[PDB]
Every structure is written in C-alpha cells, then in structure tokens.
C-alpha cells in the first residue's frame, strides 16, 4: 500500500521541478541549480551558431 504513495510523491516532485515536505526538497534543488556553471564563450557561440545555420542553408539550398 505505502509503495504507491512513494511513487506519487516522486511524480509530484518531478512535476514541481519542471515548474521551478516538498517545499524543502524544491529549495534544495534550486540551491544546487543556482550555483554558477561553466559557460560556452559568447564569441565561440556566435561562430558555432553561424556555422550551423549556414550548414542548414547549404542542406536546403
């Protein structure tokens, strides 16, 4: 019986995370998610994006 409830809370948390007892869990996940992550160099993004858009236009030309 108590096995299907553990399944339900898990699914509620999953759904809450997408949106973002359970409020503490979300706060912890947000805490982890709010830490700085490595970032692709902005000027590298410019060139890669242009390369991809061009490759596409080359595929469709």
């Amino acid at each position: 019986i108590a096995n299907v409830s553990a399944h339900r809370r898990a699914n509620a948390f999953a759904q809450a995370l997408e949106d973002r007892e359970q409020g503490k869990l979300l706060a912890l996940a947000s805490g982890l998610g709010d830490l700085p992550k490595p970032q692709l160099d902005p000027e590298v993004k410019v060139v890669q994006r242009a390369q991809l858009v061009a490759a596409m236009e080359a595929m469709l030309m």
């Binding site: 692709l40 410019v46 994006r49 991809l52």
Partner: protein, 138 residues
C-alpha cells in the same frame, strides 16, 4: 516543435535549437575532455552531426536533448561558408574574437575596441592581420 520546424529546413529554427541546448551539451562534454577548446570543438561537432542526420530523427520515443547527449557521448568515446567559417575557428584567440565581433556581430571598430579592451588603432591592426590570415589558410 522547434525540431519539427528545423526538419522543414527553416535554418533559424536549428539556430534556436543551438541556443536552447548548447550550454547543456558543452557542460556534459567539458568534464570529460582535456581542455576548453576540445570541449568547444566537440560541442560544435555534436550539433553538426544531429543536423546532418535530422531527416532520420523520426523514431517513436525520440527526445532531442537526449539525442544530443548520446551523440556527444559517442564523440567523446571516439575522440564554402563552411570553409570560410572553419577558417575562422582556426585563428588565434585575439584574431578570432576580432573578426567575430566586427563582422559576425557587426560591431564597429570603436565598439570592438571597448569589448576587447584595446585601442581602435590596435583593432585596425588586428582586423587587418586577422583577415590576412584567413586569406592564407584559405
């Protein structure tokens, strides 16, 4: 879908897919290779592979982000405009950034100088040396 829109050859839709997913692909790769340059290169290759196979991306339970991750995983394990642009990727850091800001972003010499922390004189010299280098290795 944006994916469904790219599969219609709307090139900008694929650009948007890059916007949405590039940092996640990069971060997956970053910790698995030796050096930022390699991580950047394999990020580019991951998207290029997805693009080249995008006409096959039609199986039942497909997920685009998951597909990108699995492609990058494969690449790490196995680790004209296209020529113009891959030539740009070969320039040294200073020359690459200069041409990207000036010509790909359309920043003026003055705007570029402000971003790069150089004087406009140094930018005029730099953009000259950068385009001359593209002229040789291309």
């Amino acid at each position: 879908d944006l994916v469904d829109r790219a599969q219609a050859g709307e090139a900008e839709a694929f650009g948007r897919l890059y916007d949405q997913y590039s940092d996640t692909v990069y971060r997956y790769i970053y910790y698995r290779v030796g050096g930022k340059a390699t991580a950047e290169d394999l990020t580019s290759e991951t998207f290029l592979r997805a693009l080249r196979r995008i006409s096959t991306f039609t199986w039942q339970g497909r997920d685009f982000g998951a597909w990108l991750v699995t492609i990058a995983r494969n690449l790490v394990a196995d680790h004209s405009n296209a020529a113009l642009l891959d030539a740009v990727r070969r320039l040294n850091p200073q020359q690459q950034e200069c041409v990207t800001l000036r010509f790909l972003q359309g920043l003026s010499v003055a705007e570029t100088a402000r971003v790069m922390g150089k004087n406009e004189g140094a930018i005029k010299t730099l953009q000259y040396r950068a385009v001359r280098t593209l002229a040789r290795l291309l």
